[PDB]
Amino acid sequence: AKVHGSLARAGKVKSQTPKVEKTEKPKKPKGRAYKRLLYTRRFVNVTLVNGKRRMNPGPS
Amino acid sequence: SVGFGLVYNSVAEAKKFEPTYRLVRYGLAEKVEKASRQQRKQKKNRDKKIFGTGKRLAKKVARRNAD
Amino acid sequence: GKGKPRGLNSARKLRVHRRNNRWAENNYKKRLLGTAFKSSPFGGSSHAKGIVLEKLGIESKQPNSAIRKCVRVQLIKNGKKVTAFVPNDGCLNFVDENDEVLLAGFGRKGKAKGDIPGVRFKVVKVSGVSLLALWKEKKEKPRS
Amino acid sequence: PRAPRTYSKTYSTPKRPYESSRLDAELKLAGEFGLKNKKEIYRISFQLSKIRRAARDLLTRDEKDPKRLFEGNALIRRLVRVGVLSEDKKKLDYVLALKVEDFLERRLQTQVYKLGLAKSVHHARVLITQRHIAVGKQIVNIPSFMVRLDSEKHIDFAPTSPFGGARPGRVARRNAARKAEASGE
Amino acid sequence: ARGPKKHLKRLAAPHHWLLDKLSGCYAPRPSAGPHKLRESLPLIVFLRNRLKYALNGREVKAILMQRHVKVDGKVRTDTTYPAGFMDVITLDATNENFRLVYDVKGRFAVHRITDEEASYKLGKVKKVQLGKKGVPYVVTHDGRTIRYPDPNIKVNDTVKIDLASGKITDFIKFDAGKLVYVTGGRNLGRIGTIVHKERHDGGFDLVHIKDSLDNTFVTRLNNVFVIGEQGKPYISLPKGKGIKLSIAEERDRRRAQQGL
RNA sequence: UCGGCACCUUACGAGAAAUCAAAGUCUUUGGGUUCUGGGGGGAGUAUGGUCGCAAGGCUGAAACUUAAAGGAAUUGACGGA
RNA sequence: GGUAGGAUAGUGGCCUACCAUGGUUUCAACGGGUAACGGGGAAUAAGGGUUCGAUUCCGGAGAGGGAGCCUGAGAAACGGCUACCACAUCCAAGGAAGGCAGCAGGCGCGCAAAUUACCCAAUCCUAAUUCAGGGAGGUAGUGACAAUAAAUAACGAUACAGGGCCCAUUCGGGUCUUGUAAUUGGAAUGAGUACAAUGUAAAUACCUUAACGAGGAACAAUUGGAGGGCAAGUCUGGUGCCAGCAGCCGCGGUAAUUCCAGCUCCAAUAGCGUAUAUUAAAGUUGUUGCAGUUAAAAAGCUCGUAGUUGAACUUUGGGCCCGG
Ligand SMILES: [Mg+2]
Ligand SMILES: [Mg+2]
Ligand SMILES: [Mg+2]
Ligand SMILES: [Mg+2]
Ligand SMILES: [Mg+2]
Ligand SMILES: [Mg+2]
Ligand SMILES: [Mg+2]
Ligand SMILES: [Mg+2]
Ligand SMILES: [Mg+2]
Ligand SMILES: [Mg+2]
Ligand SMILES: [Mg+2]
Ligand SMILES: [Mg+2]
Ligand SMILES: [Mg+2]
Ligand SMILES: [Mg+2]
Ligand SMILES: [Mg+2]
Ligand SMILES: [Mg+2]
Ligand SMILES: [Mg+2]
Ligand SMILES: [Mg+2]
Ligand SMILES: [Mg+2]
Ligand SMILES: [Mg+2]
Ligand SMILES: [Mg+2]
Ligand SMILES: [Mg+2]
Ligand SMILES: [Mg+2]
Ligand SMILES: [Mg+2]
Ligand SMILES: [Mg+2]
Ligand SMILES: [Mg+2]
Ligand SMILES: [Mg+2]
């Protein structure tokens, strides 16, 4: 249990992480209309029903 | 709209039983030009210091601290 | 006959035996002796304010290889010295030498968390301006 | 010093936060009935928990008990009146068989859609919220209103608040004022 | 502590006054008087919360300081005057006379009586004693002392008080067969005369009482008020005749009397 | 035939298994009763008391630490079997 | 404990005088601790329970700490007095005055808690009293303590999924549009703003309502997560056992599903996360209901007192009537 490790590197990765601004996008609806959007994407017009269903497919 | 109504038998009995604030609302009593409550309480506590009418106190003060 | 007495007039023996054996649990022992108000630097409290004495670098337990970036803190209400982890990337740059931190527990009710030896507390606010808000972008630390 | 004000929580969260079956069932419920929240399902589950616990403690009582007859008949009468339990089927072991969809069908947001008048549950919600639909001649803007089976025939558009008449409406009036500004007088 | 309490918290008031929980921290504390604090009804609760003749306490004071009300013949301009059981309230305007009797739910109902019945009240004899110079008196349930009673008047009997002079007109013994009105306990407000009486030397004599639908009930002797013989009571009786129907019979009556 | 030290078979049963005529008659949970235990350490330590000539015995913590320690069996590998 | 007296409003070792030797205790006295006011109650629990109750009601105690007393029906009163102790204010130094655990407010203490506001209109109380007084109380302010309800959009036409018709023959037929055209059209409404009215003691706010009030309807919803537990990514960029994450198991040493980000997705949602305490989960306190051969645990063995527990036995049966 050694308590005098070097503190020079504190914040290294976050300080040298490249800055990407968030992409401006349309707003999503809030509340009742968001649960409506979830229900249409999951149980009404779902097509990605491989096995059971998937929600976040990546590039294959 | 739902509310409550009183019709007194006469306007003398209306003035007699009707509360002061409702008579001020209806114009049948003048709003009094009284003071604020803290000023009234402070005046009362000032008067609690004085015993008697205080005319002798005022003349003794004006006698002692004028020369 | 299953060891314990069963008879209708044996409630004294049953209750005295339960009172004696209740002492073997951790929580009942700790609650009844008042351990949190005699031991436990946060003397019964959830949070405690303290003054930073020093920035320490604790080397993590094996098989983890890192320096953990803690602070040594003297508690204002109590005078006890504790070591508190400063949780996020950076955020030891946000503390200072000799200023004010609000400290909380660290999840496991005593009992240091993870690979971090001997550290039972974390830093929640420094200078009353909330390390999460300092870390995101939200508030700025006061200079004085 | 005063009398304390009584208040009660009206819902309960499930013990298991992430069950795929339950999350699928409640999203199915909120899509069928047009709900804002999982809290609107949790409230109905809370009401069923209380109804079923009451009917259970009455059902463990012997039949022809005075409390069983009085409180069980009052429970049955309330459920028949609100329409969750049918106008037949007036037994305590059939109110244990009640489910959530029975109460969700009795909402004003479901009844407004069911009795024409709305064309969707999400249109029903924003008809109700927007000071349209009147249940007697009383405007209600609460979608969780529990229509009580003798108000169903009286649910209609409000006397005020157009689609019910007596005045055009805010953006209709402004747009007609703009067309009067442009075209004529 | 340190002396007599002058206030009464609301929620410490008697439940039969039916005071609303909100709209004040304080209940009207009954004054000292003929009846107890918890066995009585203050005049502000009668005139504002029962008859609805006054909306405030200030209107109760304005009614009372015009000497319209009188309790048991005398005027009683006290707002929190403890009007209790058998007390007669006479309101001169609208010519109303009331006798304070319990309805069978246990509360003081509004029971309008006539001017003949308002002339008298009934008093349960609480003790029979000799006063000084050897004069006998009886003490009734409302604190009245009546000198020179009949020598047949014993404890737990009921005298009839003439209320223009506080004199005993006639009286009813306590013996098997005669009506009982119940003025406390959980059988409060009931009627039904008798089965018998069991003695229990040392404390709490008990009375068995069996109403006209043959439902027996036991009451303590101190909660038992004789109102007459079986049939023809000496008072008028309130709306219900003191039967105490059960809740199923109450709902079977209330559903009937709302559809015409 | 009664009483004893045990043994052998079976598993009705029990058990996590090894095994067990008791370690059975236990979620189909109550024959009577005493004592002991509540994750591993720290620790049978410190302190207080008590007994002993002493060695020691009896009673007996806590701070702190820890994510396993352990039990039985299986397969493998290894053994100066 | 007895006798007598004194004192008391009165019983009484309450005190006194003279006697006697009692009173309590393993059925736990007495002593110690309490981060103990007690109760009604509260949280949670299938049931049995566990934990909390300073705090709206009731009872008690206290007014910096002790003690003593006056008055009075009632106080050992503290918005009464007296003394001492502690603390502290004014002063011409001679003296004099003090008690926020009332209300508001301050300092300090701390993780931790609001206006030096308005009013007696309500509820009640007090008075000689309908009238006066009331920081009791009510009203507003501050207030994400907790609780209730529930906005942040809805609906069509131009584009496309196909569920299709008579063997749509190859897409036409009077099919039938939920997802996509950061398209296109008019409707609807309250957040806000306010004329007034109502509200109210006077207001504010609610409720109602004239005129205003959305197209990116910028009138823009957040907080935590996306390896497992545990719902959601082997997507891209950066870092390279560092920085950091990670309740636990674990990830990071050059392709990181876990770090820091961007995109997308998930969960709850005007809320969501963290720390502590506690309840369920915990049959891990076990009365219900644990375990003791080997996992923790049968006292080395026997006697033995309290405690607990303790064999069987004593009017059973038959008939008749009323009778819910
Ligand atoms: Mg699959
Ligand atoms: Mg027994
Ligand atoms: Mg409208
Ligand atoms: Mg008091
Ligand atoms: Mg009073
Ligand atoms: Mg078995
Ligand atoms: Mg344990
Ligand atoms: Mg252990
Ligand atoms: Mg020792
Ligand atoms: Mg082994
Ligand atoms: Mg004497
Ligand atoms: Mg004596
Ligand atoms: Mg004596
Ligand atoms: Mg004794
Ligand atoms: Mg204390
Ligand atoms: Mg308590
Ligand atoms: Mg308490
Ligand atoms: Mg305290
Ligand atoms: Mg006191
Ligand atoms: Mg103080
Ligand atoms: Mg006095
Ligand atoms: Mg004092
Ligand atoms: Mg004071
Ligand atoms: Mg006082
Ligand atoms: Mg204060
Ligand atoms: Mg107050
Ligand atoms: Mg706070």
Ligand SMILES: [Mg+2]
């Ligand atoms: Mg303040």
Ligand SMILES: [Mg+2]
């Ligand atoms: Mg007032």
Ligand SMILES: [Mg+2]
């Ligand atoms: Mg105040």
Ligand SMILES: [Mg+2]
């Ligand atoms: Mg918004």
Ligand SMILES: [Mg+2]
């Ligand atoms: Mg409106």
Ligand SMILES: [Mg+2]
């Ligand atoms: Mg990520």
Ligand SMILES: [Mg+2]
């Ligand atoms: Mg998953």
Ligand SMILES: [Mg+2]
């Ligand atoms: Mg992760």
Ligand SMILES: [Mg+2]
């Ligand atoms: Mg359980």
Ligand SMILES: [Mg+2]
């Ligand atoms: Mg166990």
Ligand SMILES: [Mg+2]
């Ligand atoms: Mg062992």
Ligand SMILES: [Mg+2]
């Ligand atoms: Mg062992």
Ligand SMILES: [Mg+2]
């Ligand atoms: Mg042995």
Ligand SMILES: [Mg+2]
């Ligand atoms: Mg023995």
Ligand SMILES: [Mg+2]
């Ligand atoms: Mg026996």
